[PDB]
């Protein structure tokens, strides 16, 4: 929501004469968008322990279950939670595993990569929907200039 909003947002054009600035309503000058450098997207993995805690701490054959984008019913019953933020530059923007059920490192890595697979789709979707919005706005203007 925050990213799509920031990319959709436009501040009014302005110009500056020393001490003073001149701010414009839409009729005066067109608004200009903000400077977006990259598009960070978060994916949240939920971890469930199917067996006992003893198996998690000192047991082989890790049975720890991981799911993506848990519902409220799932979120209320989870034993662990990881949030990974990535962008289309294959950058790990951030990672947060603030405690919870101990998970094997390799599993967490796999989570990161699958998350990337998802943020590709989501990013392309955001860009697409944005451009469609702008195009529809333009075509509306074209419908307004001539009845």
């Amino acid at each position: 929501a925050v990213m799509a909003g920031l990319m959709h947002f436009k501040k009014p054009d302005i110009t500056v004469h020393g001490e003073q600035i001149i701010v414009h309503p839409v009729n005066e000058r067109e608004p200009v968008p903000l400077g977006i450098l990259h598009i960070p997207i978060c994916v949240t993995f939920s971890f469930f322990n199917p067996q006992d805690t003893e198996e998690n701490i000192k047991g082989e054959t890790n049975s720890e279950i991981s799911i993506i984008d848990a519902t409220l019913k799932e979120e209320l019953l989870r034993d662990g939670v990881l949030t990974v933020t990535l962008n289309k530059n294959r950058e790990v923007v951030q990672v947060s595993k603030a405690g919870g059920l101990p998970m094997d490192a390799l599993t967490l890595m796999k989570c990161c990569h699958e998350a990337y697979s998802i943020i590709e789709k989501i990013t392309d979707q955001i860009l697409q929907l944005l451009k469609e919005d702008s195009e529809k706005r333009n075509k509306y203007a074209a419908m307004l200039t001539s009845e």
Binding site: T53, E54, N56, I57, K58, N62, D79, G80, L82, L86, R90, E91, V92, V93, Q94, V95, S96, K97, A98, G99, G100, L101, P102, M103, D104, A105, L106, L108, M109, C112, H113, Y116
Partner: protein
């Protein structure tokens, strides 16, 4: 800009890429102030950790009939850095995030369920700071909790690893933490399983796994150190108590 990593493979402090800072710990340092306690030095990091409990809940709220309540208080003193901070840190969102992180870390390690209707208060004072402070907090908590005789499944070793270009640097100090992205790890015992995984700045995905690899290893060493202290402190205070 300066040689964070020289071609010779040395750092500013004179360490190599895979070497921990000086790590020393002391147990039962405040017997009159808390049930468990630890004083810890990691590099220039100096931390006092106090564990009070298990004890009767202050309020007759905050009482859980099935398990103990675990609270963590992190006091970052104004004199921990070179430049004194005119502002307190106690209610900063960073500190709250750290506190909740440590709590949710040791909720899954400490057997709270065998201490129902009790409260375990963890009181931490960071006397001196020099980067990698999160892992230090983790280690201090582990030591102090073990000193308190409070049951837990295993050690939790905290460590930090920076990423300079292609090469990862183990246990970063303050200068290294700046001008570099760092990963903090909370590793359970000798396992490969992570209690904590913290990345707060941008890192190339394809190089993240490698950073973890050394990190875990480092953490293991840290465990071996903490362990090594405890046993000694045990061996000393179980022999002298005899006769």
């Amino acid at each position: 800009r300066l040689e964070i990593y020289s071609p010779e493979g040395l750092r500013l402090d004179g360490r190599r890429w895979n070497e921990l800072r000086r790590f020393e710990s002391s147990i039962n340092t405040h017997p009159h102030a808390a049930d468990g306690s630890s004083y810890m030095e990691q590099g220039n990091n100096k931390i006092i950790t106090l564990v009070k409990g298990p004890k009767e809940p202050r309020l007759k709220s905050q009482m859980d009939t099935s398990k103990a309540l675990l609270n963590v208080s992190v006091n970052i003193t104004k004199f921990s850095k070179f430049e004194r901070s005119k502002s307190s840190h106690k209610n900063e969102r960073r500190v709250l995030e750290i506190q909740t992180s440590l709590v949710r870390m040791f909720e899954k390690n400490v057997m709270l369920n065998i201490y129902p209707r009790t409260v375990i208060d963890i009181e931490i004072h960071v006397l001196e700071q020099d980067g990698g402070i999160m892992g230090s907090l983790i280690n201090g908590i582990t030591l102090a909790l073990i000193d308190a005789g409070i049951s837990m499944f295993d050690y939790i070793s905290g460590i930090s690893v920076g990423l300079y270009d292609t090469t990862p640097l183990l246990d970063t100090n303050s200068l290294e933490e700046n001008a570099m992205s760092t990963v903090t790890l909370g590793v359970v015992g000798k396992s490969e399983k992570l209690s904590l995984l913290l990345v707060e700045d941008k890192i190339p995905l394809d190089r993240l796994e490698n950073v973890l690899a050394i990190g875990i290893a480092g953490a293991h060493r840290v465990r071996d150190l903490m362990d090594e202290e405890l046993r000694k402190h045990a061996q000393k205070r179980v022999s002298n108590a005899s006769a």
